[PDB]
Paper text:
The spike (S) glycoprotein of SARS-CoV-2 mediates receptor recognition and viral entry into cells. It forms homotrimers protruding from the virus surface and, once engaged with the host-cell receptor–human ACE2, undergoes a substantial structural rearrangement to fuse the viral membrane with the host-cell membrane. The S protein is also the primary target of the humoral immune response during infection. A large number of SARS-CoV-2 neutralizing monoclonal antibodies bind S protein, especially its receptor-binding domain (RBD), providing a basis for vaccine development.
We also resolved two cryo-EM maps of the Beta S trimer, including a one RBD-up open state (termed Beta S-open) and a transition state (termed Beta S-transition) at 3.5- and 3.6-Å resolution, respectively. For the transition state, the RBD-1 appears less “up” (the RBD-1 tilting angle is about 49.5°), and the RBD-1/2 appear more dynamic than that in S-open with density for large parts of RBM missing. In the meanwhile, the other portion of the S transition is in similar conformation to S-open. Compared to the WT S (94% particles in the tightly closed state and only 6% in the open state)8 or the G614 S (35.6% open, 26.0% transition, and 38.5% closed), the Kappa and Beta variants display a great population distribution shift towards the open state (~50% open-prone transition state and ~50% open state, without detecting tightly closed state).
Author numbering:
A (entry chain B): 730 to 827, 850 to 1068
B (entry chain C): 689 to 729
C (entry chain C): 924 to 1162
D (entry chain B): 1117 to 1162
């Protein structure tokens, strides 16, 4: 997802002015199509978040006993001592990736339907169903299976005979547990590790900063401030100067909405890739070559992150 | 006696999985389901 | 056969009862209606000109002023087509994307069988039947969904003679007194045999392994020949 | 003989090599020849 933005072009272009508002009525639907475009984008942000995260209709929960065959999931599963059900790796994800002027200039940001705890709750249900029941809870009734017996089928699916797990289970568990320690260390050490999501936060900040700054742009008028034109000029000259601001501010909204529709298609494409990986890497096992990380796919662990989803792919190399 | 009520949305029905290192659930019966999906062309 | 025939009756009733059932195609007609309605409505917009009607400019203004007012309508109408065509290229990318998804579901869901998870409806994909619809395609996806789960006691492997037996296809399950192999997508118990399993390593490395007797289909087939073997020698001692 | 399957003669495969393929039933039948022959050897004594 990306920041839900609703901009009232009526206040953006003609901020607190009835005289300007009467001039914007001469351009008609230009104001309407801009509000409909941003409303459609905002509605699609909840669609994207639900298509990727809301793939289960039951709130699955983890057992009080953590006997997963030696595999230590404590860094990817919820932490009851915290006010939100985030894991140790999810806390690194939200701590590594991080406004008043925007709302003051008619720019309104809408909250997601699934809050930062609700998205983490679906992630907890995806983790609980995956680790206790394999792919079966996505395709039908949740079938419990011991996790070490689940892994054997995982190895069978990639052309590794089931005896390789049980004859080497202690080494395979040590390799996973050591690799998850390296996931925590890598994500805690590099500031740019979430660069894929930092580009979404940076794109929204640069776009909304351009959208606010363009209110101070003259566009050829004697002033960017509608009150400075109306304080100095009569009804004949003030309308001539205000039309320069209406055309330029109108172009600044069409530029913003065009960039948001084109970026919304990038976020739709990325949410569709995340939806297909949520089904095929998390809710299943993928025989698709290099689709769930480099190597032979065993399984993936989902983790929530700011405006996105993080896949921890486990592969046989 | 009807009115518009406001509530925190439920994410789904709650279900703790009965996980154990010696128990497995197996389907003793199945459903052949026809599901419609519609795509613009 | 009754499950398919009854489910198709339910598809008929659902599609005939709900008005929003084809909402994905109704959004194509609705988007084009709003886009073409805005495209025509904007010809009545002044865009700052003395009138939206081009003849009202030419009926009132000379060659000097009429060109200035006409350029207001040309600029605004030109922005109307640039906005329309931009929205049409952006929507055409959504139609290309949805047609490419439908083309891949036609090839993998209709022309074949898809092992892809959740690509050809919810469940294990059996088949998909295409049906045409206004501006789109409707897929009737037939999927196997596991419905009546029962809990069984299970083991990762069987120990028979100090050697570990692993399942070929299936999982080891107990009815409470006996052990059987069964497939993970339908409970049908089978005798734990040397053909249903494969051997690898001793019985110490498998965590949770259990003891049982593994049936050898060759054992009674050779024990019945051992009694024939003994009667063959007895017969040849007599002449 | 369970790990492999038969198809065609030994001339049609380019690069084929010679080896002995183990028959799990062969020692199970060799034990029947050794039992038969020891019953005959004992039966010559009385």
């Amino acid at each position: 997802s990306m920041t839900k933005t609703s901009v009232d072009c009526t206040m953006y272009i003609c901020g607190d002015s009835t005289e300007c508002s009467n001039l914007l009525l001469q351009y008609g639907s230009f104001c309407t199509q801009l509000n409909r475009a941003l409303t459609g984008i905002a509605v699609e942000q909840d669609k994207n978040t639900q298509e990727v995260f809301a793939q289960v209709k039951q709130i699955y929960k983890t057992p009080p006993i953590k006997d997963f065959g030696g595999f230590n999931f404590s860094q990817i599963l919820p932490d009851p001592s915290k006010p939100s059900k985030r894991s140790f790796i999810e806390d690194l994800l939200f701590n590594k990736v991080t406004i008043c002027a925007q709302k003051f200039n008619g720019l309104t940001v809408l909250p997601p339907l699934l809050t930062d705890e609700m998205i983490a709750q679906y992630t907890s249900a995806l983790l609980a169903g995956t680790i206790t029941s394999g792919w079966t809870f996505g395709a039908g009734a949740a079938l419990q299976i011991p996790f070490a017996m689940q892994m054997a089928y995982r190895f069978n699916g990639i052309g590794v005979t089931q005896n390789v797990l049980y004859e080497n289970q202690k080494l395979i568990a040590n390799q996973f547990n050591s690799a998850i320690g390296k996931i925590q260390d890598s994500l805690s050490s590099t500031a740019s590790a979430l660069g894929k999501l930092q580009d979404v936060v940076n794109q929204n900040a640069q776009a909304l900063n351009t959208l606010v700054k363009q209110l101070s742009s003259n566009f050829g008028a004697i002033s960017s401030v509608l009150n400075d034109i109306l304080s100095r000029l009569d009804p004949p000259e003030a309308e001539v100067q205000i039309d320069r601001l209406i055309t330029g501010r109108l172009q600044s909204l069409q530029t913003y909405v065009t960039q948001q529709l084109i970026r919304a298609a990038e976020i739709r494409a990325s949410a569709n890739l995340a939806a297909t990986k949520m089904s095929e890497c998390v809710l299943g096992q993928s025989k698709r070559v290099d689709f769930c990380g480099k190597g032979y796919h065993l399984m993936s662990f989902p983790q929530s992150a700011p405006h996105g989803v993080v896949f921890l792919h486990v592969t046989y190399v | 006696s009807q009115s518009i009520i406001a509530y925190t949305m439920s994410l789904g029905v709650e279900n703790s999985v009965a996980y154990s290192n010696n128990s497995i659930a197996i389907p003793t019966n199945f459903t052949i389901s026809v599901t419609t999906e519609i795509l613009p062309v | 056969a009754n499950q398919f025939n009854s489910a198709i009756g339910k598809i008929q009733d659902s599609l005939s009862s709900t008005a929003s059932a084809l909402g994905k195609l109704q959004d194509v007609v609705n988007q084009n209606a709003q886009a073409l309605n805005t495209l025509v409505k904007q010809l009545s917009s002044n865009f700052g000109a003395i009138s939206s009607v081009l003849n009202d400019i030419l009926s009132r203004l000379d060659p000097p002023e009429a060109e200035v007012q006409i350029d207001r309508l040309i600029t605004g109408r030109l922005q109307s087509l640039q906005t329309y065509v931009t929205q049409q290229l952006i929507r055409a990318a959504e139609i290309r994307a949805s047609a490419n998804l439908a083309a891949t579901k036609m090839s993998e869901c209709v022309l074949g069988q898809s092992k892809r998870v959740d690509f050809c409806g919810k469940g294990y994909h059996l088949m998909s039947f295409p049906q045409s619809a206004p501006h789109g395609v409707v897929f009737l996806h037939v999927t196997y969904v596991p419905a009546q789960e029962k809990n069984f006691t299970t083991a990762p492997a069987i120990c028979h003679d100090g050697k570990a037996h692993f399942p070929r296809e299936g999982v080891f399950v107990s009815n409470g007194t006996h052990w059987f192999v069964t497939q993970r997508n339908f409970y049908e118990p089978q005798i734990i045999t040397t053909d249903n399993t494969f051997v690898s390593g001793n019985c110490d490395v498998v965590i949770g392994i259990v003891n049982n007797t593994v049936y050898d289909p060759l054992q009674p087939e050779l024990d019945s020949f051992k009694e024939e073997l003994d009667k063959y020698f007895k017969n040849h001692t007599s002449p």
